């Protein structure tokens, strides 16, 4: 793994503490600990976390690559937010934040609500799309996927999470 051959650079504002196989991080965005590793060691002495195979399992290189990507993700999480630009368009499709509960009136007979988990914040400057901020990109990706799985983008409308003027491939069936 040549991504595991590159340690992750840690700035002065991010504090890293290792407790055995458990990695705990500190930042301005928040304290977070999700991942504890199995066959990859971590240490640092020159402000760069190292990722190494322990023995000859022929897999700990790949696990060290995963650990490098995970630590890069949590460093960028504790300095900045991750996922924005969640758009879901439709006729009478509304969304307004209220605490950790968000409503999605998307053409259903019942109104539906999504309970946002701890460590996420959602804002919507306009009715049809919602912008998120989070320190865990796995959690914000699961939340954005759940909000996109409440109403799946059909090909005839052309919805989905798109950035600026980006086009979802639109089917042109039934053109009489």
Partner RNA sequence: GGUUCUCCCCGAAAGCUAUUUAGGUAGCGCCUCGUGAAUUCAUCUCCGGGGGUAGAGCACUGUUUCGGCAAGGGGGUCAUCCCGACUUACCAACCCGAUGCAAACUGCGAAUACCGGAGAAUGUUAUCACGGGAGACACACGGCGGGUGCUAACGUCCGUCGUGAAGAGGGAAACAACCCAGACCGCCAGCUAAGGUCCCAAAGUCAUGGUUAAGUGGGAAACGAUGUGGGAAGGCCCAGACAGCCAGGAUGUUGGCUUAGAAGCAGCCAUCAUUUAAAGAAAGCGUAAUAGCUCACUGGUCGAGUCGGCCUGCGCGGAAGA
Partner RNA sequence: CGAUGUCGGCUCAUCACAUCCUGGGGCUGAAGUAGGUCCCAAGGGUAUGGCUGUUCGCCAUUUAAAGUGGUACGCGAGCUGGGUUUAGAACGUCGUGAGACAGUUCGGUCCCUAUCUGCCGUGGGCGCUGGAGAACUGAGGGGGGCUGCUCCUAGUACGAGA
Partner RNA sequence: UGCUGAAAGCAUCUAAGCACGAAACUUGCCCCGAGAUGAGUUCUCCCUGACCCUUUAAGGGUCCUGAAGGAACGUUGAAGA
Residues that bind RNA (CB under 7 A): 1-4, 34-35, 37-38, 58-59, 61-66, 69-70, 73, 91-92, 107, 109, 137-138, 141-142, 145-146, 149, 152, 154-156, 167, 169-174, 176
Q: Which residue, 16 or 159, is less far from RNA as judged by CB?
A: 159
Q: In what order do the strands lie in the sheet with 8-9?
A: 8-9, 48-53, 40-43
- Rounded to 5°, the CA angle 140-143-145 comes to 110
Q: How far is the CB of 113 from RNA (least distance, A)?
A: 15
Q: Which residue, 80 or 146, is less far from RNA as judged by CB?
A: 146
Q: How far is the CB of 145 from RNA (least distance, A)?
A: 4
Q: Which residue, 3 or 10, is less far from RNA as judged by CB?
A: 3
Beta-strand ranges (E) seen in 13-134 are 15-19, 22-26, 40-43, 48-53, 86-87, 93-98, 101-106, 112-115, 120-123, 129-134
Q: How far is the CB of 105 from RNA (least distance, A)?
A: 11
Q: Which residue, 80 or 154, is less far from RNA as judged by CB?
A: 154
CB under 8 Å to 98, separation ≥6 — which residues? none
Q: How far is the CB of 84 from RNA (least distance, A)?
A: 12
């Amino acid at each position: 793994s040549r991504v595991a051959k590159a340690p992750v650079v840690v700035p002065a504002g991010v504090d890293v503490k290792i407790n055995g196989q458990v990695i705990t991080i500190k930042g301005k965005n928040g304290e977070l600990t999700r991942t504890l590793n199995d066959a990859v060691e971590v240490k640092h002495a020159d402000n760069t976390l190292t990722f190494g195979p322990r023995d000859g399992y022929a897999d700990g290189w790949a696990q060290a690559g995963t650990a490098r990507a995970l630590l890069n993700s949590m460093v960028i999480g504790v300095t900045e937010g991750f996922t924005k630009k969640l758009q879901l368009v439709g006729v009478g499709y509304r969304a307004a934040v209220k605490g950790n509960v968000i409503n999605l009136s998307l053409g259903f007979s019942h109104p539906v609500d999504h309970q946002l988990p701890a460590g996420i914040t959602a804002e919507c400057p306009t009715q049809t799309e919602i912008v998120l901020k989070g320190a865990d990109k796995q959690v914000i990706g699961q939340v954005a996927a759940d909000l996109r799985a409440y109403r799946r983008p059909e090909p005839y409308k052309g919805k989905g999470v798109r950035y600026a003027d980006e086009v979802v491939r639109t089917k042109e069936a039934k053109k009489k």
